[PDB]
Design a protein around this ligand. Structure first.
Ligand SMILES: CN(Cc1cnc2[nH+]c(N)nc(N)c2n1)c1ccc(C(=O)N[C@@H](CCC(=O)O)C(=O)O)cc1
Length: 158
């Protein structure tokens, strides 16, 4: 199964290259939690951004150009899946363009809403509400570790 998990700021704006203006460890924890024991596919950018391969996961990248580290480097949305093997869940941590490629063959969404105005170009692939049912709804404000109000939404493609 293929799903999508991402941190989208107001206006639906996502990552680009430079790190997003926030520090929500909560989301991070939610990431680990929903990602552990699950293969992942990510764009070059997020790759260099994480700084290190994700522990206890299958580090796969979709680009285009060579592959640095000796993570499963794929060069197509096809190879990617195969390298994911026979798992019950596929974790696509984008970024941007990566997502778009998984949206059609996508079946689930694990996003956290950040009520922060953050300029930028790229956005998250549009999707008609009813087409994606609404299961979860956990909203949390900002306290001491999370510099901004976030919100959890798991969408099951309807
Ligand atoms: C730059 N990114 C990509 C990133 C960040 N937040 C996201 N948040 C959500 N909800 N979705 C996606 N796809 C996200 N992707 C990124 C950077 C660092 C960690 C990270 O350090 N994760 C540790 C948890 C935190 C730690 O410092 O150990 C982990 O084990 O997953 C994850 C992702």
């Amino acid at each position: 199964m293929i799903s999508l998990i991402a941190a989208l700021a107001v206006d639906r704006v996502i990552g680009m290259e430079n790190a997003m203006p926030w520090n929500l460890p909560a989301d991070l924890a939610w990431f680990k939690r929903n990602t552990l024991d699950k293969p992942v596919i990510m764009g070059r950018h997020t790759w260099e951004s994480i700084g290190r391969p994700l522990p206890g996961r299958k580090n796969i990248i979709l680009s285009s150009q060579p592959g640095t580290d000796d993570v499963t480097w794929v060069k197509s949305v096809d190879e990617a899946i195969a390298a994911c093997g026979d798992v019950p869940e596929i974790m696509v941590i984008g970024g941007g363009r990566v997502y778009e490629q998984f949206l059609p063959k996508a079946q689930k969404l694990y996003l956290t809403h950040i009520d922060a105005e953050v300029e930028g170009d790229t956005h998250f692939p549009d999707y008609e509400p009813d087409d994606w049912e609404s299961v979860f709804s956990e909203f949390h404000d900002a306290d001491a570790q999370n510099s901004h109000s976030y919100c959890f939404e798991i969408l099951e493609r309807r």
